[PDB]
Amino acid sequence: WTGQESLSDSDPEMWELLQREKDRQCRGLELIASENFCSRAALEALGSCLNNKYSEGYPGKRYYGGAEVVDEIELLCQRRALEAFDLDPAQWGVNVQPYSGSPANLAVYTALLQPHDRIMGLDLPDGGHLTHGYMSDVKRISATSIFFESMPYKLNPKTGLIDYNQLALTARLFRPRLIIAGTSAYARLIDYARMREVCDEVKAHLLADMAHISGLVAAKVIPSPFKHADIVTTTTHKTLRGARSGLIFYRKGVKIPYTFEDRINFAVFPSLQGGPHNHAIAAVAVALKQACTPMFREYSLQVLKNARAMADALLERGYSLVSGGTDNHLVLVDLRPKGLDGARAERVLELVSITANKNTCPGDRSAITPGGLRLGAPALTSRQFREDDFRRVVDFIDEGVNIGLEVKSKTAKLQDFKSFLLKDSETSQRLANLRQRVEQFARAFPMPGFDEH
Amino acid sequence: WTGQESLSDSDPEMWELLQREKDRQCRGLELIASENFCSRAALEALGSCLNNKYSEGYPGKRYYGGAEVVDEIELLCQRRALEAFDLDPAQWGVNVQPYSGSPANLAVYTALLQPHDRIMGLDLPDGGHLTHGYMSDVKRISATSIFFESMPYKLNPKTGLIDYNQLALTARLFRPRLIIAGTSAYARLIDYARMREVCDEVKAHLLADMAHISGLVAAKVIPSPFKHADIVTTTTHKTLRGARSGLIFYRKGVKAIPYTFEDRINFAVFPSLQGGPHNHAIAAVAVALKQACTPMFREYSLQVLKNARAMADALLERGYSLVSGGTDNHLVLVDLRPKGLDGARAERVLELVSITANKNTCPGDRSAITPGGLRLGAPALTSRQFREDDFRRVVDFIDEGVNIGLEVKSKTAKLQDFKSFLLKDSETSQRLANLRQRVEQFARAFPMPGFDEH
Numbered sequence: 001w002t003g004q005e006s007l008s009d010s011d012p013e014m015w016e017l018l019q020r021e022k023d024r025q026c027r028g029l030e031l032i033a034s035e036n037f038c039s040r041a042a043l044e045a046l047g048s049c050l051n052n053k054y055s056e057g058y059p060g061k062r063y064y065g066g067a068e069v070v071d072e073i074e075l076l077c078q079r080r081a082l083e084a085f086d087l088d089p090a091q092w093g094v095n096v097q098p099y100s101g102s103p104a105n106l107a108v109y110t111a112l113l114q115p116h117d118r119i120m121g122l123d124l125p126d127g128g129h130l131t132h133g134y135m136s137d138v139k140r141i142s143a144t145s146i147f148f149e150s151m152p153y154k155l156n157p158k159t160g161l162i163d164y165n166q167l168a169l170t171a172r173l174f175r176p177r178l179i180i181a182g183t184s185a186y187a188r189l190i191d192y193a194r195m196r197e198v199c200d201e202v203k204a205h206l207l208a209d210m211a212h213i214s215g216l217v218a219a220k221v222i223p224s225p226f227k228h229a230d231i232v233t234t235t236t237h238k239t240l241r242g243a244r245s246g247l248i249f250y251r252k253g254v255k256i257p258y259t260f261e262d263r264i265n266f267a268v269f270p271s272l273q274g275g276p277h278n279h280a281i282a283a284v285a286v287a288l289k290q291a292c293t294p295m296f297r298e299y300s301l302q303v304l305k306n307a308r309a310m311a312d313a314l315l316e317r318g319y320s321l322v323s324g325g326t327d328n329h330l331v332l333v334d335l336r337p338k339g340l341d342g343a344r345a346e347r348v349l350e351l352v353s354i355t356a357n358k359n360t361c362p363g364d365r366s367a368i369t370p371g372g373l374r375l376g377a378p379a380l381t382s383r384q385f386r387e388d389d390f391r392r393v394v395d396f397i398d399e400g401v402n403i404g405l406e407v408k409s410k411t412a413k414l415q416d417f418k419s420f421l422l423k424d425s426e427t428s429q430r431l432a433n434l435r436q437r438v439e440q441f442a443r444a445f446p447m448p449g450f451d452e453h
Numbered sequence: 454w455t456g457q458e459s460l461s462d463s464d465p466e467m468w469e470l471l472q473r474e475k476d477r478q479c480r481g482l483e484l485i486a487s488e489n490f491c492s493r494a495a496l497e498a499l500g501s502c503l504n505n506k507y508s509e510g511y512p513g514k515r516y517y518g519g520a521e522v523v524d525e526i527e528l529l530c531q532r533r534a535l536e537a538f539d540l541d542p543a544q545w546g547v548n549v550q551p552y553s554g555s556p557a558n559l560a561v562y563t564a565l566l567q568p569h570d571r572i573m574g575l576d577l578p579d580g581g582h583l584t585h586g587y588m589s590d591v592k593r594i595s596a597t598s599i600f601f602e603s604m605p606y607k608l609n610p611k612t613g614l615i616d617y618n619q620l621a622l623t624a625r626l627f628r629p630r631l632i633i634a635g636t637s638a639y640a641r642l643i644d645y646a647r648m649r650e651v652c653d654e655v656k657a658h659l660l661a662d663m664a665h666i667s668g669l670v671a672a673k674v675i676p677s678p679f680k681h682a683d684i685v686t687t688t689t690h691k692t693l694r695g696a697r698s699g700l701i702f703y704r705k706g707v708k709a710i711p712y713t714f715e716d717r718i719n720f721a722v723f724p725s726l727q728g729g730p731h732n733h734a735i736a737a738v739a740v741a742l743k744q745a746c747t748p749m750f751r752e753y754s755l756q757v758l759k760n761a762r763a764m765a766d767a768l769l770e771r772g773y774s775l776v777s778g779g780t781d782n783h784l785v786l787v788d789l790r791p792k793g794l795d796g797a798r799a800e801r802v803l804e805l806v807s808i809t810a811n812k813n814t815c816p817g818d819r820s821a822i823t824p825g826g827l828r829l830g831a832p833a834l835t836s837r838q839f840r841e842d843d844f845r846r847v848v849d850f851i852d853e854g855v856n857i858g859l860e861v862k863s864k865t866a867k868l869q870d871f872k873s874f875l876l877k878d879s880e881t882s883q884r885l886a887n888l889r890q891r892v893e894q895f896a897r898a899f900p901m902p903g904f905d906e907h
């Protein structure tokens with residue numbers, strides 16, 4: 001045993017699993033707005049000898065020795081992070097160690113707040129993220145809601161937009177120490193200027209959690225939360241198209257100085273994390289360098305055009321869009337006027353190799369079965385899909401919905417619907433036909449990564 | 454742009470750096486007891502398309518679709534984890550999603566405790582981990598100490614062992630909900646029978662954080678925490694030799710009326726603390742867990758014990774004192790005070806000759822700010838096919854470092870003077886540059902797990 005044997009030789013059962021997942025990705029139409037396809041170059045860094053190095057601490061300030069090279073990598077990741085988002089290093093710093101987006105958020109909170117201090121975020125069914133505080137009427141769900149005290153803010157159901165007026169009103173009463181501007185299921189641009197005014201008024205830090213939109217921000221195809229936020233968190237996957245990891249950006253220098261840097265860095269290590277995942281950090285550096293190029297601006301422009309094209313294509317075929325359209329990378333479809341719901345559509349589409357998400361619509365409860373569907377452009381755009389290809393994706397979705405409708409008029413409950421798609425031979429064949437057409441279409445497009453895994 | 458271009462072609466700057474680090478790992482003697490060298494097989498999984506899949510939730514209970522293969526990979530990683538530690542599926546479960554060791558511990562605490570509930574763990578300078586609870590006298594340091602209330606137990610400073618008497622006494626008073634049996638710098642086996650007695654009396658949960666010794670426990674070359682603990686956490690790197698990730702094992706089924714760990718532990722990992730699983734890590738971990746079930750790994754681990762034994766016996770036989778007198782595991786705690794030096798000095802000398810080891814605070818330390826010891830580990834170099842005579846020769850290289858360290862301590866005043874004297878003084882430079890060249894030439898000749906060039 002050398003530990004230099006190939007995976008296919010040494011673990012054939014695992015190698016066969018990688019190959020099946022590779023085929024599924026190649027043959028599927030990936031419309032999950034948080035999905036993307038990582039470049040080979042980034043994955044080569046990710047599965048590298050950088051996994052082997054413990055480097056607790058920071059560059060030039062490590063616990064263990066032998067970090068000369070790892071220090072250069074982390075420092076380079078830092079520079080490319082600031083360059084990607086066009087940040088003056090006198091005015092901004094960045095921590096590149098969070099293990100993911102959720103740890104990046106928890107580290108911001110533990111850095112700046114005391115246990116049980118107050119946070120406000122977009123409610124989860126209104127399109128916010130678990131890590132912005134989430135508790136149900138029954139219990140505390142996010143650790144954000146356990147260690148801190150959250151109160152959500154809401155959409156205006158009339159417009160499908162964030163109700164900035166109700167946020168202002170309600171923040172005056174609750175008096176949060178931290179307000180989070182950022183979304184998981186929102187088709188529009190956040191009024192960061194308005195968020196900032198509410199924060200200034202109640203003396204709260206503004207956190208922009210730009211995970212979903214970070215690549216669009218890097219490419220300068222939408223306005224930057226960095227103009228208004230104190231702290232910006234993000235994932236490095238999603239629209240940035242890197243390995244799974246996180247980033248915390250913070251202001252530094254004069255506001256009387258900013259005091260985020262030392263607190264943020266201490267919270268990440270030693271308070272929360274152990275050894276940095278240097279292999280991830282390297283992969284992120286690779287993706288961040290990719291994000292500074294003309295190629296990536298053109299990619300991000302195309303993502304917007306494709307989402308528009310998908311939105312327009314849906315409108316023409318008689319669908320309703322929550323907020324009436326999109327200004328970003330995803331669209332929110334309201335299926336209730338069509339007579340179907342998200343849980344039904346999602347399952348039908350899954351069986352024809354189209355992966356989308358059910359999505360709560362404004363006004364409905366976090367209890368009633370979701371009336372909507374979230375569809376995203378980033379992943380397929382990475383496979384060189386253009387506007388005509390997304391029109392074709394919408395054709396396939398429509399057939400999916402129409403099958404979904406017919407199965408609904410023959411079934412009672414949700415579990416009836418789900419096993420009827422498997423058992424009933426006439427509908428299972430109509431799905432088999434659509435699946436094969438979807439996969440023929442999808443397989444012809446290029447796919448970032450390695451060929452076979 | 455396809456995203457199928459090579460790293461060497463598209464990012465030459467980064468590729469350079471991967472090669473410099475691969476070279477640094479090859480030419481050095483890696484004596485940090487937390488380090489190891491991951492298999493190519495595992496790295497191939499880690500740098501795969503599994504990075505691309507969002508699979509929040511658990512196998513068969515995902516929030517998004519298209520997870521059929523990722524479900525099987527997670528389930529496989531579970532079964533392989535249980536098999537690696539010889540656990541009955543009816544009596545144990547395992548969560549394979551923690552992003553590292555620290556997240557695995559925090560998730561146990563948030564799963565089983567309320568905020569501000571009480572925790573006890575071996576004090577940090579007495580050989581425990583940050584994540585066991587660590588405050589200084591100035592401030593709270595670990596998040597473990599911010600969100601929960603930690604009181605550290607200690608070593609008996611005569612024996613260098615864990616004072617199981619004081620711990621039983623002090624735990625009757627503090628009333629912890631959770632006591633942690635685990636170490637980062639302890640050369641001996643832990644009395645998990647005794648830990649569980651203390652936990653039974655005061656009605657606390659016993660957590661075994663075996664990160665450091667998980668390979669040794671899988672190999673069955675030391676006794677298992679799974680006989681006495683109801684919760685076990687580990688890294689998947691270190692002695693398991695996998696990718697960076699973590700595991701949480703927990704008891705399940707009938708207690709005496711069921712155990713209720715499973716549901717709380719899984720909920721704490723997701724949705725409470727983490728987001729999307731790192732499926733590429735989960736797969737690499739599964740590969741390494743397969744490797745740990747094999748006869749090859751038992752021999753790897755036996756050789757780890759023997760190589761630490763041989764490093765220990767060799768150090769004793771050159772007139773070095775060692776904390777606790779010996780080792781029953783993968784490392785040796787070297788008290789450098791009775792040889793008239795200390796950790797900070799030794800570490801910086803050894804580093805400049807491509808030997809990487811750790812500063813370590815010993816019981817007999819009379820200052821509290823510069824430690825008087827050195828942690829030296831087997832697992833890494835053993836993975837490179839080192840045997841007892843190779844470790845004797847490492848010790849010989851160390852002895853020359855320590856002796857340059859002793860010979861520079863008598864010619865210097867403070868610790869920052871000591872550090873400059875190494876780089877600045879030409880006779881000490883080229884005595885180090887000579888010792889380095891010989892260490893590198895010795896280390897290079899041994900094999901290295903992973904890819905050849907990155």
Ligand SMILES: Nc1nc(=O)c2c(CCc3ccc(C(=O)N[C@@H](/C=C/C(=O)O)C(=O)O)cc3)c[nH]c2[nH]1
Pocket residue numbers: 124127128130136138139141184185509516724
């Ligand atoms: N955009 C977006 N929106 C989402 O909602 C979402 C999710 C699911 C989030 C989520 C997870 C658990 C509960 C929860 O309530 N947990 C369980 C309750 C247990 C109990 O009460 O004991 C449950 O799922 O029933 C509620 C919500 C993943 N990715 C997402 N992306």
Ligand SMILES: *Cc1c(COP(=O)(O)O)cnc(C)c1O
Pocket residue numbers: 273274275276487553554555556582584635636637662663664665688697698
């Ligand atoms: C190394 C270690 C950890 C933490 O591992 P990371 O991957 O750095 O978070 C936790 N517990 C023990 C006992 C350890 O040795």
Ligand SMILES: *Cc1c(COP(=O)(O)O)cnc(C)c1O
Pocket residue numbers: 034100101102103129131182183184209210211212235244245727728729
């Ligand atoms: C995806 C996302 C996260 C969390 O990322 P993970 O890597 O899954 O933890 C946090 N916040 C927002 C707004 C997100 O979209």
Ligand SMILES: [Ca+2]
Pocket residue numbers: 220221222223
């Ligand atoms: Ca713009």
